[PDB]
Design a binder for this molecule. Structure first.
Ligand SMILES: [Ca+2]
Lengths: 421, 421, 421
């Protein structure tokens, strides 16, 4: 049996008192993680190559994920059964090298480690065939599914309905990778088409976006014993909410009963998204490693409820010895509410001493002792409709109740382990 | 560590729209599974032979089951802790070869793969001693437990009660197997006695069946590189509800509070059940494998709320190559309501292309692409008491609301993997 | 992958009827476990030495716990993710041999097996450095966390508050072990300081204890192919509720809303605890092994709601053969309510036949068949505030409703397995 996974766990304190607190700019879809993670998260994978005969083989893989608040010993939870798929290599004679697979699977996810941000993730129940050799590149095709809560109604008259149902969203993914564009440079192109797929009799409320597209281009350049990846993505309509390749075609639906059922007009995600990203990890000599990110993401919604986000961070690593190093992480976020036009910003500085299994910025396990400082100035926030956060923003100064954190300061510190095996 | 288990997961679509739908005749206790399974189910077993000294050994085994709807990546669930037992082989000197065990265990379950129907399953918390050598056969004794919700009351003044409690049902199982009846033929006999076992002070509402018997006879004939099993079972009263060997002695109990507590008269399971079954898996030459089922099951309840069920199916497998085949599954169900006398029927046809690790109809893992068509005509259904399904049936045409599917058609298609390791 | 853990599961019956019942004296913090365990409990640990280079290494360890009532086959549950930590050995050059670790961990727990009583357990999310060699002993430092529900409020005016929050309690642990006090005798000293650590803006209700201390001294004497441990422990204030090293600084807090929020007067745990314990396991010749416990524990609370507890038990084991033995367990408990002055007592006698993997009282797996008898006479009980048990006690004879079991008798019997691997 093959045992693999990922896990992080630790104990922390907030300067002003109590447990460690984590800092994320309101409106931002991520945070700089070093010394800024407040939960124990673990994915335990058990898999096995269940059959092999020549060049043909079947691999079985699973993944059970646990997320607990690390505030006590006994902490009950509802694990997420995230993967359970079979992959058969070389089964299709005329498509030598291709792999066919079916089941829940983390499918070719693309992420930026330091901000724990996935920018291309269509994972979920699915099937497909990958690595079809085209000579000049490798072609992969896949179809996965995600479902939204509600959104499908059996309308009797007008917008009055008898029943609701969860809406399934299908994604059809095509990728071409390994395009040798320049020396030590490679390019991958990808197209994603997603659409809400309603059961017979059910229909989406008026205004639902229903479908959308997403185009991805990623260039990888090998250098300084690492790489640099340049990404450009453009998503449209239904693909803008999740923004990683999954469709949210009924996003914005809602209803109210009085008992007559009324399906409100969908406050949809019609619009577009532009994401220009550049991140990498390289070695500057013998004593220094460096991870960095620079990203501009603009979700332009027709309903004007989007956000313009800029994020920049840097994580240098100084290697005192092969198993001990000092890390520093500095990250800046700036989010402009499309609605109010105001801006929220935050910068966090983290200094950590670390012992790790290897001399790389990528070596894990790692045991860290850190101190984090974050300063933010948030001018807007989402209107907090009593414990519920709304899609609408409002300036903090307006008497309206928002989830804004205002203008403040904080520092935390503690120990933590992180590992992938 | 020994890693074993079972798992199935896939993605599907319904011809008329949305996610895949699964077809099962109302009243039938099963459905023809090929291309007719709508969930990701997995059993992860981790066990180990923890001690061995000569012919003696102790094996530890566990089993954690997960069932998710495969409609998203992150799907939280409450896993079922189904097995955790220890088996000691050859510990009893005077009963050489016998195995003593205790703990939660899937005890000698008998099922028909194609319809995923267990017809002899007393699994649960238990203990026993198996494989006592009698020379002419092997004898096994076991006691397991199951518990029903409520059913036990502390009656103050006739049927008015102070407290309720869950009712434990004990089953005492005796099996004699390996009776060589004819060349390549073997016979196994089994007796099961089950009963509701109330705590002191508590009593079952008046009318409860309390106990029952079940007798099983199974003949196995080895042939055509497979087998054919002929099964005859007769169950009595408390053994008719679950109908696989577990007792439901307080089945039908209910109560209402107004606060005075009244235990209604138990609408019991007094009656009998007859099940005549024949299933098998054989090889017809080099290119063909075949699984088949034929079953008649009649639950005759004194109160007349039972069902008479006929099911017939066939699953031929044509082997294009050792790792690629085409499967066809045709299944028919006919269920007569004992109450109304009406009949429900359905036939489903499934065509699937498959790649599997081996050239057997039993080889797993397997990756399938299928198309399923089902036609049904249901004349009756259980009276749907608003989201709640009742024990009482009603003709679909009667203005009464039932869970009947009417007269209709549907087809689905998709990909799926299934594996046992 | 290293597979380890603990598990117990079985089936039982109560003489007077129904499922097995378990006997624990009201007021007592434990019960004599042999043939007195009513659930299936299992801890599945999967770990691995993920890196090794010379004398340095990193070990990754996990632990997922399951507790089910063993009353049916399919029993859903919410597993507890109890451990997830990394330990790096020999990473600190100047502290040779020391191990640094971080993550959720069962940290150096001290318990008495026969009563399943942990008397020194600060397990939970934490970090620390253990086994610092001082020459004359080993020094270990650790900080772990536990959190109480509520207890932290944002007071606006008087005991009126706007928001509540869970209260984190930090423990700072220091231990010195391996003090060679006499031939074959060793002594370990330990100090624990814990305190509720409130978030800025929040405060504990008035009356809360906030912090406390605990001092432990444990002497181990090796003899009769076993040992004898003598323990003396003294705890103060916040350390008295859990009483094993974890702090409960806001213990007793409560509130009521009418919507104005009022934080009641904390009915605190101010006071002290004295625990004098002696337990061991030794071999008396070839055919006899013996486990024993003798403990006096007195929780003296300022508010007089404490208890004075005496427990004594013995478990001899007669070895018929190397893999078969007969066990007897006799345990007595006596608990005096500090409030009422009344006493509750119970004695349970257990006779069990056992097959185990080894000839030790410590050998596991083990399969047992037992018969248990318990007699109790409880004069007091906690005031049962309708399903809810209060901190206040009342004599059974007083017309007040308490959770007292009165004066009675009961016997149970069944089979069970227990294993640690
Ligand atoms: Ca749950």
């Amino acid at each position: 049996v093959d045992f693999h996974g990922y896990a992080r766990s630790g104990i922390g304190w907030t300067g002003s008192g109590g447990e460690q607190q984590c800092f994320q700019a309101t409106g931002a879809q991520s945070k700089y993680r070093l010394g800024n993670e407040c939960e124990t998260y673990a994915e335990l994978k058990l898999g096995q190559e269940v059959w092999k005969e020549g060049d043909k083989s079947f691999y079985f893989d699973t993944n059970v994920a646990y997320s607990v608040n690390q505030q006590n010993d006994w902490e009950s939870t509802d694990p997420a059964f995230r993967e359970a798929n079979v992959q058969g290599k070389n089964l299709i004679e005329w498509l030598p090298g291709s792999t066919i697979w079916a089941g829940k699977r983390f499918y070719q996810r693309h992420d930026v480690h330091m901000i724990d941000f996935y920018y291309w993730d269509i994972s979920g129940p699915g099937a497909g065939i990958e690595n079809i050799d085209l000579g000049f590149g490798k072609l992969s095709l896949a179809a996965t599914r995600s479902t939204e809560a509600g959104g499908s109604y059996t309308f009797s008259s007008q917008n009055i309905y008898d029943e609701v149902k969860d809406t399934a969203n299908d994604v059809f993914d095509v990728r071409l990778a390994g395009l040798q564009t320049n020396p030590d440079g490679v390019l991958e192109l990808g197209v994603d088409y997603g659409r809400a797929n309603t059961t017979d009799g059910y229909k989406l409320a008026d205004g639902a976006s229903k479908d959308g597209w997403m185009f991805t281009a990623e260039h990888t350049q090998s250098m300084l014993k690492g790489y640099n990846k340049f990404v450009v993505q453009y998503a449209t309509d239904a693909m803008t909410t999740q923004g990683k390749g999954q469709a949210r075609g009924s996003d914005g639906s809602s209803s109210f009963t009085e008992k007559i059922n009324y399906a409100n007009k969908v406050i949809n995600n019609n619009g577009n998204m532009w994401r220009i990203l550049d991140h990498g990890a390289i070695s500057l000599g013998d004593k220094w490693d460096l991870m960095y990110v620079g990203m501009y993401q603009n979700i332009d919604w027709d309903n004007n409820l989007g956000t313009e986000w800029w994020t920049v961070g840097v994580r240098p690593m100084y290697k005192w010895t092969p198993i001990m190093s000092t890390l520093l992480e500095v990250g800046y976020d700036n989010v402009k509410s499309q609605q109010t036009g105001d801006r929220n910003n935050q910068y966090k500085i983290t200094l950590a001493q670390q012992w790790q299994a290897g001399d790389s910025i990528w070596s894990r396990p790692a045991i860290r002792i850190f101190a984090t400082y974050a300063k933010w100035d948030e001018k807007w926030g989402y209107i907090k409709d009593g414990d519920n956060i709304s899609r609408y923003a409002a300036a903090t100064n307006s008497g309206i109740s928002t989830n804004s954190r205002g203008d403040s300061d904080e520092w935390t510190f503690g120990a933590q382990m992180e590992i992938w095996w």
